[PDB]
């Protein structure tokens with residue numbers, strides 16, 4: 001299993017930077033002749049470290065067609081780097097925004113289903129993702145996506161069905177906003193927002209922050225109040241009613257009335273099969 005000399009990990013370009021960390025595109029190049037393979041490298045910037053070492057083990061334990069591949073780690077005596085496969089097509093968020101004129105609903109629902117299957121899988125390990133958004137989805141090719149970040153992922157406790165813990169508040173279930181509770185259910189609410197993002201094709205004027213801030217008129221509080229009076233993101237221009245209905249069932253205030261991911265992949269596969277024509 002793959003073992004990495006820090007010394008031969010050559011920085012090529014910056015892929016994402018945050019509050020406490022970053023993702024780089026590096027080439028691992030032991031033969032020093034630039035024929036090494038390109039990888040993605042996650043590092044911390046300024047217990048985070050405990051959380052980072054859990055993340056590594058989570059990603060490692062995942063092996064799935066729609067989850068980004070763990071490659072190994074890279075350390076200094078005694079500046080931890082998590083190594084993953086590099087997917088050159090980049091995030092679905094940017095890829096959708098780019099090729100909207102070549103990506104019909106059939107494609108949209110393919111990605112949607114591959115996202116559910118990945119999430120279904122996470123659930124089999126009681127993993128809660130916590131950050132479901134097009135931002136964190138990668139495109140392997142035109143017909144395949146992978147969930148590409150597990151920064152916030154948690155393992156549920158063995159006797160419980162929720163984990164209590166800047167947050168992307170416009171993607172969050174209300175119980176996440178008010179009780180900091182995270183669950184399969186809250187992953188489902190967020191999935192609904194992913195479905196919303198996909199069918200707006202990332203039109204900046206139609207993003208969850210823009211529409212929610214519009215409907216609002218502490219931002220967080222305003223959001224809680226809005227969600228509680230059944231305010232919701234509108235149906236995207238051109239969205240079929242069955243896709244919007246899946247969204248509104250994901251955004252049910254009651255955790256227990258939200259659909260399962262196995263059910264979501266199913267309905268979504270049947271709606272995609274009914275458009276094939």
Ligand SMILES: C[C@@H]1CCN(C(=O)N2CC[C@@H](S(=O)(=O)c3ccccc3)C2)C[C@@H]1N(C)c1ncnc2[nH]ccc12
Pocket residue numbers: 015016017018019020021022023040068084085086087088090091092135136137138148149151
């Ligand atoms: C879309 C991907 C997931 C998201 N990622 C990103 O920008 N983030 C993940 C971590 C955070 S962070 O590092 O900014 C951060 C760290 C700590 C606290 C807070 C923030 C942002 C970009 C990735 N990307 C473009 C890639 N492109 C090609 N192949 C890839 N393989 C693996 C990733 C990847």
